[PDB]
From TrEMBL:
Enzyme Commission code: 3.5.2.6
Pfam family, one: Beta-lactamase
InterPro entries (alphabetical): AmpC, AmpC-like, Beta-lactam-related, Beta-lactam/transpept-like, Beta-lactam_class-C_AS
Listed name of the protein: Beta-lactamase
GO molecular function terms listed in the Swiss-Prot or TrEMBL record: beta-lactamase activity
Cellular-component GO terms for this entry: outer membrane-bounded periplasmic space
Catalytic activity: a beta-lactam + H2O = a substituted beta-amino acid
Sequence similarity: Belongs to the class-C beta-lactamase family.
Top EC class, one word: hydrolase
Keyword Signal included in the entry's annotation: yes
Amino acid sequence: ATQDGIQRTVDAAIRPLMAKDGIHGMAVGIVAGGKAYVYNYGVASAETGKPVTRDTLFELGSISKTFTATLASYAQVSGNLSLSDTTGKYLPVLQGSQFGNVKLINLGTHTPGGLPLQVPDEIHDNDELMQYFKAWRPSCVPGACRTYTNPGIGTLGLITAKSMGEDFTPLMEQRMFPALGLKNSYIDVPEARIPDYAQGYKKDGAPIRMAPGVLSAEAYGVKSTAADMTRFMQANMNLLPLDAKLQRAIMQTHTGYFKAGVLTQDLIWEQYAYPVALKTLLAGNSSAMALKATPAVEIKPPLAPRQDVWINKTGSTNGFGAYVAFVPEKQLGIVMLANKNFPNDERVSVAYKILTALAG
């Protein structure tokens, strides 16, 4: 009945969106009054007609970075590292180099002083990456310049791993996902679950799934279900009784570090004063914020986590589109998972339309 009233709102945004953009399959997770509801639409694969189900895996894209941010936060709370530390401390290869003096906080907030969006094609392993970093020079002010980057948060992943004497993928698959209670969440999809892996579709309609690469696990590599992400949102609103340290780690990813345009940059999470206007969300989640070196102002001291915000992250691959938005003070959230990289403007609009109707 509560579920039926929410379904009617969610259907009324999603059916038309999928018809308009020719999205084959979507899984939408809602959190309302702290409860998880999951609504599935269309087909995992157009070729076979396998429907989207509870167990269907979508590529999270850059939403993976929130898991990386969570793991770094955990290592901080455990005293494995400080975010004030330099990359040099953990990758001595880089001690003496300019990049070796970039602080971890700058890697988790896209403020390292200029880094490319994508790991450049010439870098094929962590050793060629380390070399590139030795050569690296800052092209804007660290802690005053926001350049959205995979290698940045990626390298925070690698440094987090080292701090905890363990490789990244296993840290995530064997400690983090189980500690968060996520049983359908994978960097490496097991053979047994490959039937669950939804088919991605390019803009033209050709089938595709993501390619692994340098720092991909740390940057864009996670697959998950709406149910799993719905539980991630509940965790990110302090609603699940977990061990104190993991609970503190998760909420401290919400600390506000830099003001950049209309956006507050947390540890990967980007947040807005609630209530929030559509036009604010659209400007904060513009391609310009994603592609361009934007002025960033350090918040002194860092802004404590707060309930009264709209916290979001976008995520894309060649074949998939994903969007997480939640509002801690309302126990309210949406994750949209699509097997098409459909425009971010529409993701933000539809999320805005749905969470606004549910707020009252």
